[PDB]
Amino acid sequence: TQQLHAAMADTFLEHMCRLDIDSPPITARNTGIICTIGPASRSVETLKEMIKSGMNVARLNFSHGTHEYHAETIKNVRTATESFASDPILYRPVAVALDTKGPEIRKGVNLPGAAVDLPAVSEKDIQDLKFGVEQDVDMVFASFIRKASDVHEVRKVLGEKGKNIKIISKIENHEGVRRFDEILEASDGIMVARGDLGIEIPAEKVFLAQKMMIGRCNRAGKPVICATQMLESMIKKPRPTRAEGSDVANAVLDGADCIMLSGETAKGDYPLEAVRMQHLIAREAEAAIYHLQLFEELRRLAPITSDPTEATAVGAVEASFKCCSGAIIVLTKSGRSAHQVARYRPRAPIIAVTRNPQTARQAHLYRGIFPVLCKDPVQEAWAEDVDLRVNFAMNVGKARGFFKKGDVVIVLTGWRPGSGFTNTMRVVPVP
Amino acid sequence: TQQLHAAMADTFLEHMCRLDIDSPPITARNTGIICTIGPASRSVETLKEMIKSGMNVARLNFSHGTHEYHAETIKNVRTATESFASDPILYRPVAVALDTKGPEIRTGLIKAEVELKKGATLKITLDNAYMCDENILWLDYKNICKVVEVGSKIYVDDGLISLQVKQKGADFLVTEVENGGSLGSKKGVNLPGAAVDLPAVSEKDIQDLKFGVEQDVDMVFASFIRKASDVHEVRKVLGEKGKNIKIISKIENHEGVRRFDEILEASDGIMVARGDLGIEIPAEKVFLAQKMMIGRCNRAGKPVICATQMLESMIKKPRPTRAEGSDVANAVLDGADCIMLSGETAKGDYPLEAVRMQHLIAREAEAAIYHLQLFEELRRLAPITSDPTEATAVGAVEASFKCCSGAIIVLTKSGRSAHQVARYRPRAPIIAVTRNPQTARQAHLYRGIFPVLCKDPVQEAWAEDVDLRVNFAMNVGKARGFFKKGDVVIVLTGWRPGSGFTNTMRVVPVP
Amino acid sequence: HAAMADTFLEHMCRLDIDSPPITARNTGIICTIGPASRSVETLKEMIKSGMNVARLNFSHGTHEYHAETIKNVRTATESFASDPILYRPVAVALDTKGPEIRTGLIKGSGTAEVELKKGATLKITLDNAYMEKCDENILWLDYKNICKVVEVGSKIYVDDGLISLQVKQKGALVTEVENGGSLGSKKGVNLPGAAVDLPAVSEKDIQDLKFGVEQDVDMVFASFIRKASDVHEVRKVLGEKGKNIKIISKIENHEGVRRFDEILEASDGIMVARGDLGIEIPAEKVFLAQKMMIGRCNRAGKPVICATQMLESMIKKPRPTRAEGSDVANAVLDGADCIMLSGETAKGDYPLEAVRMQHLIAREAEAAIYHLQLFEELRRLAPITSDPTEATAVGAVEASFKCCSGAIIVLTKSGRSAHQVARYRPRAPIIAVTRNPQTARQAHLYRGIFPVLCKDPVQEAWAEDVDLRVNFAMNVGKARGFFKKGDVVIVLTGWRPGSGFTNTMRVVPVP
Amino acid sequence: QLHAAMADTFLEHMCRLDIDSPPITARNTGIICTIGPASRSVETLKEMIKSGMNVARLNFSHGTHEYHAETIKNVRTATESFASDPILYRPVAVALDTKGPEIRTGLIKGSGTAEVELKKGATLKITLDNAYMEKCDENILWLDYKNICKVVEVGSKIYVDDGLISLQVKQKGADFLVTEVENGGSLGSKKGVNLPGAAVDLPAVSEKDIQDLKFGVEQDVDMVFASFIRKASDVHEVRKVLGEKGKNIKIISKIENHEGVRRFDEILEASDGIMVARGDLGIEIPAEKVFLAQKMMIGRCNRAGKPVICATQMLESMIKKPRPTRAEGSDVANAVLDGADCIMLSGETAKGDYPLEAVRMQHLIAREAEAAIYHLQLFEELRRLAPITSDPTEATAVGAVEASFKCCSGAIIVLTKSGRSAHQVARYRPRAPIIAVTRNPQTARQAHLYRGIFPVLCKDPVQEAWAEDVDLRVNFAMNVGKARGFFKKGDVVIVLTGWRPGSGFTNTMRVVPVP
Ligand SMILES: O=P(O)(O)OC[C@H]1O[C@](O)(COP(=O)(O)O)[C@@H](O)[C@@H]1O
Ligand SMILES: O=P(O)(O)OC[C@H]1O[C@](O)(COP(=O)(O)O)[C@@H](O)[C@@H]1O
Ligand SMILES: O=P(O)(O)OC[C@H]1O[C@](O)(COP(=O)(O)O)[C@@H](O)[C@@H]1O
Ligand SMILES: O=P(O)(O)OC[C@H]1O[C@](O)(COP(=O)(O)O)[C@@H](O)[C@@H]1O
């Protein structure tokens, strides 16, 4: 009863009328969880407890701290992550995100609708960005991105050694919102950094820009993060306010791909509980999603394509709703084939099984993608290697309770090795 | 343009206003064409031109003719069909359909016509050997007294003459002529409302169906079905020798309309037989029954046939009326899988012009179909399947619109996998490749399915064998102009030979 | 049950032939008056059966002949003027001949249908020496400039598109028959695709329009409108004495369809003249043109008529065909304001039967209309307005759906207040009370409007005069069965006497 | 947000949300404010009326009858301070929040301010013997629920101090409980206790509530916020206690437990309104499910046309800070986008340091969220789900709303005596404000519970001719509308009247230009 009665309502109002607090959700949680790591959670042993509580991405705020400090944070993060590698099935990749300092003023001061002469990427940012490339980070949260000319300046700094590092522009000013479209078309994703946004724009208007930015990225198929202050009271209290709970649930209902925690995990006194709460609420909001309107409106807004993979993805999502599938298993190398299934927001989890660890780590940016890293070696026959990576996803889904033997799942593959060829959709029962 | 400008509309109204007569239909014709064969089309030379003009199913009306007669009809249809079998790429399968006689009621030989004045008195007698003047007519039993009663009305000769039982009668019946006119010999009489005690499959029908199974018919049009047991009574007579023969129940009276749901469940398809239905139920209500039965079969994924008087005036004139051109087009927009011609091709003076006209109207109407709404509502009114073939067909048709593919190539042994794709009505044509000739001939009942018979022998490697059939569809799709090399098509496959395993869908480039 | 459906597909499945329609037929019925219906006795029964608008076809007959018909129509109309509660306004429509191309007399004989051999040569000469000397080898047409419009082996259609030819000559033509037939004296010629340069309003149309103003006709059916300038030429010809006469532009050729927007913009309404349209454009595309023009006029709130050959077989048979039964219903479902009858009531054998059938089918079709989508779509596509009348109209239509009212009573001098209500297509009838006789007759053009002519004198207290006409509508609604006492109706009045000023909507109980 | 409201889809409507599209002047969402020490001065209460307060709430969980009678007198004096100008006077209703079945602890170490430090994993005994009643410490805790043993089994969870402290039982002794602390902290005196998933056999209407309700009827309040209604019979007990003298006062059921939501439909049919009461609800049910219950309740009362309020912790951070939380900003807006009739403030106005900024912030966010409402979808779904009524006013109301959208009416002027006609118009959520004209002060105050109804109380005397009395008020509404900036001269307004004096006869809709 994953709010399936509400998902069959002919109207959006009756769908709300049918929401049932006694109807439990599916064990799979589709929204990524980004926890800012700091003094309260840098310990290697407590980082393990945060992975178990559902952390997907470890955020590193570079507004303070030295490279020697952040390298120890990354060292322990990876130590906690690989502590579960003694198990390929239940292992879970954890990403490393670099939030740059950006154009600041420092105690930090703020100035609304003004010019901000500071450059997009100063030498402090360049030395921090090149540090991330050396540390093998998975993504960059570029702060105070005001125009498209800033993302290109950041992309050039990362260079070709980190060409595959995904850039997440942080909308933090009024100019960034006013010029959001050229920023989104230039970025790998967007973060709605409500923290600094609520000071530059009127606080009563932050919800307008958040829902606008999430929708526009939702139609564009790009990840969007809701950031800062979702459970701020949890910094000193073990339970969030009613407003904070509904904020996390509404961000997931708005369509945000990941939800973020900053002070709640960096310096607060209840970092484990804040991660556990965000996991619980996001899973509940995923059940309350009105997929009947979401899947239709996303398809109607999406254009016709000559791309075989895009056509397979829509058909795969349409097939999953038809048979209430346990998961969408997608063989992917660069994550792209999994990203194209995610943009149509299926209900079932997207078990994106891959061999590239960086794509498994970057998979958390997208809603509903559950990456699994296959350490098995390539078989001589390609057919055997494809079905091996699919059976690897079957064993994972059974262990993580995503589905059981006899259930129906959709498997996405392609006709030849290499990337951009995902074009084969199969409806197979779980062995 | 294929009326794609009107397809990208939000409202049905704006979609109606965007309809363009200068928007040429690029797609093939998706609606099946059925044509009754008669003295105007029995010849081989005529039948080949009917195939060229678009005939997908040959209907044989067994209320007239003899087994010897119909046997030569079938022989000529099969001769005309296989005359195009030289090239298997362009070959078109043509099915043969037996239209059961059913529980009809005719009159006696007059004294060739006569005249019954309006308001006069006619004593319908059930006497012995009077099998007829302007006062005393004889029926084929019907047991009219046991089913007739008060001021009941009898309709002689296709409802053109209206009677009115104005008495009771021991073995006769005194009636007043509610609507006059002439009267030929042995004309059919309909008794609306009443429950004709005649059986489901009469002794004549048994010999007909047993003859049809002995002649390898592809489907039967069961006349005057009223209850679900009638379809079972017909399927029993077909037995195990003809268990693969589709049963299309003809809905023709108030009972068959009321009991429609159980009839649809027991039958393989429905024919909206508007001819007799227009006599048994008020003629102004037929469009309601027609739209009701088409939508319900569309909901149930069963074929539905719109039949009779679609191009009636084309029996004597070379062009249809404006009402007839719009009736065919609206039957397509209603959702009819097939359309039918009766006297237009059986005994008319322009049978070819009729088939060509139905092919032309249907192709334009398929462009005017509001696919944006039809597809969403068809999926909404369909339940969660747990069947891999059903889910595969939904994604295939979803990928059909997304990539705007030129065709849906489906490998099918019994047609079922193709029927499940056509259920969701893709704009793109369904190229169903089969090695089973009967499955190719029966695929015509389904809208949008272009069956193609692959006569190539089965290959040893199963991967290479289904590849050979996928290419076979690629060649017939490029030969008939459905798509060119480099286009995107949807190819439906399964994971092992035999039927029931269609589970693979691919978007592959046309070679 | 059908109106309460979340999907259009389920709306079709819930279409019940056992749900009796409401008492109110909303689609106007336009009957062409001819030799079979000119008698006052027959025109009386035509009004009783449901004729709202009498149409005179000025393609034939003389002014003396039509003036007698108009006299007979008004005699049969005022035959019921004694009780103004049951009296039905019946408008008179003038159908212009327009730029018609006709042939001569065959062998100088007005009723000598000659012959034509499929493929035989036929001379198309302009030499007036063959005017009353047409033979099976030489045919004369009255369009002297045909050779400057028709050239590359083009197609020429004679006798309602039945006979088609292919010219093979030049200079003031050798026709090669492409479809044989039987010619006749003074039959119509169509030149599809070619640009006929004939004047919009010929010297003959001037005399008919002058006659029409003198005869106090309510609307003109301007045949063969090619552009908006033609509509303006008709409007100027009518002048001051001819204003208030509604101009219905007949769309009959490719040019009128291509320029439909400018033509509609300058017209009072549109008539889908499928007869000629089916010859000028391919007959398969006519339904696209009809549905396009019906949708576009619905969006604009202007009347649209679907015409010619709706019940064509009823010229000779008392019962229509199934194609004809569905064409009338689909016209109403398309959203046609009026359906028309031409030869069926002018020269046919069953004029009354044809009017009753159109009434029956239209009333059944009005019930089956999916109002949930139509009222929503017609509202979405309609823009916002500062006009209080427009705001009061939508509010009144939404109110009538909410309380399921029996009627929507509107007082109007011009008719406009009633027209703005009918644009949003309520289910309940619109009883437009007026003291203006022409406004009552012209109201027949709009769907759902049931005009009543109040003849009681105007009271001194305007409020009492307003309340008087409201009670008059209550009386006719009670008398005609639209609603009973205790039911709820919507009443629309204004805040001051005079036209416009309609801003009051009151939900009142029927006394 | 006229561009977002024209989108054919919800997604595009969200993408079209312009942060630079200024809202309308009218704020359609009622603002309820709990009155307390930081809000009781009539100098302050005047400032809250001017900052947007429409309903003043009295939490009868604490305080005595003489204390609350002072607040009411202080509230009423603040409102009548504006009655000098009838064209701008804003009615302010007062509301009585009952205590309900409440479980409070005892005094710690004989003080009211003393606090002990509890530690997770430590032990704490819960006894019902009235001896330790004012001798609580980290070892013995007393609570005033006598039968707190015939409900709590072994291993259950008892929550103390607004759910901040968690206990885990381990032993039951009829009179004692040897629990264990799961989450510790400073334990105070007389803190609230929450027992989730237990048949609290305490009555919904206590003897203290029966006296507080009779005090409410005597004090001429406008509505009753009853607490912890588990069944409709509880609403009937409140209804009977109010009797005939209090027959007009609205009963607003606060759902605060698992039984309330499970029987919400039966409760909503028995009440005149609903309060979500998220505070107690987030403790009795998992906090991650509160948004589900809130959305379900707001939707079901929208489908029914009854008022629903979102309460507790909407701007909680503003108790100590002058600027709210983005989550709190997102929460007020999303409550307005959910369709909540009114939004409430509890600690932010009762004891907070910035009560005025919270009222202003709520009025700001609600004005913005009202513009972002997808009126195209809402008005269609409300009509498709509302029945075909035989009432002439329901048809007039939905007909005026459809006409309001058609001409973009500046407002919908409604003449109402019992407010029922303004309620019927509000049920369909027009964008334009509902200027409701009444001579009934009880009506002009109770109209704040419904969204979009801007109540105006006409103090002019009844003219001799009834048709002249209607035009006098219909002209008063445009005076209020022209002044408060809802429209100007020439704009088109919808006016709803009746054919006869007396309630229940409004059936006339008029599209008129403002003079
Ligand atoms: O998701 P991506 O990066 O576009 O690649 C998906 C690819 O994975 C495959 O399943 C197998 O690729 P590999 O040979 O790299 O394992 C292909 O069929 C498909 O093209
Ligand atoms: O349409 P049907 O009756 O399910 O048949 C489809 C079958 O055809 C196949 O494509 C292959 O069948 P064959 O090898 O017998 O030709 C299977 O994948 C599938 O089960
Ligand atoms: O359709 P029209 O021309 O606007 O007629 C509506 C008019 O009729 C009335 O209801 C009454 O008009 P009269 O009584 O003067 O004939 C006016 O209030 C209104 O302006
Ligand atoms: O109290 P309700 O039900 O809202 O009704 C409002 C009433 O106010 C009126 O407009 C005028 O009544 P009053 O004489 O009390 O002013 C009536 O027409 C209507 O019945």
Give the residue on D whose Cα is nearest the Cα of C394: D403
How many contacts (CB atoms, under 8 Å) link A and B? Answer: 104
Do D197 and D210 share a structural domain?
Answer: no
To the nearest whole angstrom, how far is the Cα of B431 from the nearest Cα of chain C? 26
Q: What does the alpha-carbon distance between residue D177 and residue A406 come to, in Å, rounded to a whole number?
A: 48
| Residue C250 known to be catalytic | yes
Check CB contact under 8 Å for C395 and D509. Answer: yes
Sign for the pseudo-dihedral over CA of C405, C409, C415, C416? negative
A362 pocket-lining for ligand 1 (C-beta < 6 Å): no
Tokens of C8: 């259009």
Of A38, A80, A9, the C-alpha closest to A271 is A38
Residues in chain D with CB shorter than 8 Å from the CB of C488 are: 390, 392, 395
Closest CA to C413 of C387, C392, C434: C434
C25 given a catalytic annotation: no
CATH number at residue C493: 3.40.1380.20
Which of chain B's residues have a Cβ under 8 Å away from the Cβ of C329? 284, 287
Report the distance separating Cα A338 and Cα D287, nearest Å: 32
Residue indicated by tokens 């009126």: D375
**Per-residue buried b or exposed e for B48-86, using 16+ beta carbons within 10 Å of the residue's own CB:** bbbbebbbbbbbbbbeebeeeebeebbebbbebbeebee
| CA–CA distance, C319 with B160 (Å, rounded to integer) | 7
Cα end-to-end distance, chain B, whole Å = 24
What atom of ligand 4 comes closest to residue D421's alpha carbon? 4
| Strand stretches in A13-84, DSSP E | 32-36, 57-61
How many whole angstroms separate alpha carbon C396 and alpha carbon C383?
17
Nearest to D354 by CA among D44, D61, D79: D44
Pairing of strands A372-373, B246-251: unpaired
Pairing of strands B181-183, B114-116: antiparallel
Q: How far apart are CA D495 and CA D400, in angstroms?
A: 8
CATH of the domain at D162: 2.40.33.10
* Residue D402: φ, ψ to 5°: -60, -40
Q: Is B382 in a helix, a strand, or coil?
A: coil
- Judged by CB atoms closer than 8 Å, whether chains meet at D392 and C503 is answered as no
C257 & C332 share domain: yes
Q: CA-to-CA distance for C336 and C11, rounded, in angstroms?
A: 20
Instruction: Give the span between the Cα atoms of C444 and C447, in whole angstroms.
Output: 7
Residue span of the structural domain in which C290 resides: 25-98+200-365
Q: Among all residues of chain B, which has the CA nearest to that of C360? A: B284
Count CA atoms closer than 13 A to A222's CA, side-chain side.
22
What is the CA angle B173-B174-B175, rounded to 5? 110
- Residues 6 or more apart from D431 whose CB is under 8 A from it? D5, D24, D373, D375, D404, D405, D408
B13–C334 C-beta distance less than 8 A: no
Note whether D162 and D251 are same-domain residues.
no
Alpha helices in D339-489 (DSSP H): 347-350, 355-371, 375-385, 392-407, 420-426, 441-446, 466-483
Is B393 found in the same domain as B483? Answer: yes
Q: Which listed ligand is nearest to C439 at the C-alpha?
A: 3
Map tokens 């004139």 to a residue. Answer: B317
Distances from the Cα of B14 to the Cα of B18, B487, D414, angstroms? 6, 31, 36
Closest by Cα among C295, C343, C27, C426 to C160:
C343
Together in a domain, D65 and D154:
no
d(CA D317, CA C486) in angstroms, rounded, equals: 58
- On whether any CB of chain B is under 8 Å from the CB of C104, the answer is no
C156 in the same domain as C300: no
- Please tell me which residue in C27, C32, C55, C291 is annotated as part of the active site: C55
Q: What is the CA radius of gyration of chain B?
A: 24
B133 is in an annotated binding site: no
Is C511 buried (19+), middle (13-18) or exposed (0-12) by CB count in 10 A? exposed
Residue among B17, B321, B360 minimizing CB distance to C292 = B17
Residue C55 appears among annotated catalytic residues: yes
Whether B179 has its CB under 8 Å from any CB of chain C: the answer is yes
Residue type, A357: P
Strand partners, C139: C124
Rounded CA separation A399/A376 (Å) = 18
The three-state secondary structure class of B88 is: coil
Cα of C171 to nearest chain D Cα, Å: 59
In angstroms, the separation between the Cα of residue B404 and the nearest Cα of chain A is 7
**H or E, element range at D194:** strand D192-194
Q: Which of B199, B228, B263 is the last residue of a domain?
A: B199
Between strands D157-160 and D250-254, the pairing is unpaired
Distance, CA of B94 to CA of D327 (rounded, Å): 68
> Which element (helix H / strand E) includes A149?
helix A148-158
Q: Are residues C387 and C496 in the same domain?
A: yes
Q: Is B59 annotated as a binding residue?
A: yes
Within 10 angstroms of residue A185's Cβ, the number of other Cβ atoms is 11
Q: Hey, whose CA ends up nearest to atom 14 of ligand 3?
A: C497
C175 annotated among ligand-binding-site residues: no
Tokens of B80: 């005309």
CA–CA gap between residue D213 and residue D243 (Å, rounded): 10
Do A154 and A164 lie in one domain? The reply is yes
The burial class, CB within 10 Å (0-12 / 13-18 / 19+), for C362 is buried
Query: Chains meeting A at 3+ CB pairs closer than 8 A?
Result: B, D
Probe ligand 3: pick from C408, C421, C499, C504, max atoms within 8 Å of CB? C499
Give yes or no for a contact between C378 and C424, defined as CB atoms under 8 angstroms apart. yes
Give, as one character, the DSSP assignment of residue C103: B
Task: State the Cα–Cα distance between residues B476 and B488, nearest whole angstrom.
Answer: 15
For chain B, say whether A315 makes contact (Cβ under 8 Å): yes
Q: CB-based contact (8 Å) between B313 and chain C?
A: yes
Q: Which among D369, D392, D421 is the end of a domain?
A: D369
D36 Cβ partners below 8 Å, 6+ apart?
Answer: D59, D349, D350, D351
DSSP category for residue C312: G
**8 Å CB contact between C9 and B298:** yes
Is there a catalytic annotation at residue B186? no
Buried b vs exposed e over B115-142: b needs ≥16 C-beta within 10 Å? ebeeeeebebbbeeeeebebeebbbbeb
- Cβ contact B298–C9 (<8 Å): yes
> How many C-beta atoms lie closer than 10 Å to residue A313's C-beta?
32
Residues from chain D contacting residue A16 (CB–CB below 8 Å): 295-296, 298-300, 338
Amino acid identity at D117: E
Look-up: residue for tokens 């009105």?
A290
Report yes or no: C304 and C425 within 8 Å, Cβ to Cβ: no
Q: What are the C-alpha distances in Å from B36 to residues B40, B42, D337?
A: 10, 10, 62
The DSSP symbol for C134 reads: B
Q: Residue C232 burial by CB count (10 A; 0-12/13-18/19+): exposed, middle or buried?
A: middle
Beta-carbon separation of D406 and C386 below 8 A: no
Indicate whether B17 and B39 sit together in one domain: no
Which chain B residue is nearest to residue C261, measuring alpha carbons? Answer: B17
Please give the full DSSP string across C7-38, using - where no structure is assigned: SHHHHHHT--TTSPPPS---SEEEEE--TTT-
Q: What are phi and psi of C432, to 5 degrees?
A: -90, 105
What's the CA gap between D9 and D13, in Å, rounded? Answer: 6
C143/C198 Cα distance (integer angstroms): 8
| Pairing mode, strands C188-190 and C155-158 | antiparallel
CA dihedral B88, B445, C10, B289 (to 10 degrees): 150
Q: Are residues C288 and C253 in the same domain?
A: yes
CA–CA separation, C312 vs C319, rounded Å?
A: 10
- Reading the block at residue B188, the tokens are 């059919």
- CATH code where residue A256 lies: 3.20.20.60
* Final residue belonging to a domain, choices D352, D369, D386: D369
C154 token code pair = 């083009």
Sheet holding C174-179, edge to edge: C101-102, C188-190, C155-158, C163-167, C174-179, C121-125, C138-140
The answer to whether C331 and C306 have CB atoms below 8 angstroms apart is: yes
Q: How far apart are CA D226 and CA B370, in angstroms?
A: 53
Closest to B13 (Cβ–Cβ): which among C320, C357, C381?
C381
The Cα of A167 is separated from the nearest Cα of chain D by a number of Å equal to: 22
Could you say which of A19, A206, A207 has the minimum Cβ distance to residue D296? Answer: A19
Experimental method: X-ray
Q: What does the alpha-carbon distance between residue A420 and residue A413 come to, in Å, rounded to a whole number?
A: 11
Contact B398 A296 (CB under 8 A): no
Could you give the CA distance from residue C237 to residue C372 in angstroms, rounded to a whole number?
43
Quote the number of domains for chain B: 3
Mapping DSSP to helix (H, G, I), strand (E, B) and coil, where does residue B456 land?
coil
Which pair of tokens denotes residue D253?
């059921």
Q: At what angle do helices D392-407 and C388-402 cross, to 10 degrees?
A: 140
> Can you tell me the distance from the alpha carbon of C421 to that of C446, in angstroms, rounded to the nearest whole number?
10
Segment (H or E) for D179: strand D176-183
The span from the CA of D1 to the CA of D23, in Å, is: 7
Which residue pairs from B457-462 have beta carbons closer than 8 angstroms and sit at least 24 positions apart in sequence?
A: B462/B496, B462/B497
**A266 and chain B: CB distance < 8 Å anywhere?**
no
- A310 and A426 in one domain? yes
Instruction: Match 């017939």 to its residue by tokens.
Output: B476
D157 and chain A in contact, CB less than 8 A: no
Among A203, A219, A250, beta carbon nearest to D324: A203
**Ligand 1 close to Cβ of residue A238 (< 6 A):** no
CA quadruple C328, C329, C332, C338: dihedral, nearest 10: 30
Residue pair C492/C473 in contact (Cβ under 8 Å)? The answer is no
* 3-state SS, residue D292: helix
Which residue, judged by its Cα, is nearest atom 5 of ligand 3? C412
Q: Which ligand is nearest to the CA of A390?
A: 1
Residue A276 in 3-state DSSP? helix
Q: How far, rounded to the nearest angstrom, does the alpha carbon of residue B20 sit from its chain's CA centroid?
A: 29
Task: Give the dihedral of Cα atoms A235, A240, A242, A246; nearest 10 deg.
Answer: 90
Do A130 and A153 belong to one domain?
Answer: yes
Q: What is d(CA D364, CA D362) in angstroms, rounded to the nearest whole number? A: 5
Helix ranges, C382-481 (H): 388-402, 416-422, 437-442, 462-479
Give the gap in angstroms from C-alpha C434 to the nearest C-alpha of chain D: 21
Kindly state the tokens that stand for B12: 């049905």
Pairing between β-strand C174-179 and β-strand C121-125 as defined by DSSP bridges: antiparallel
Measured at the CA of A240, the angle between CA A235 and CA A246, to 5 degrees, comes to: 130
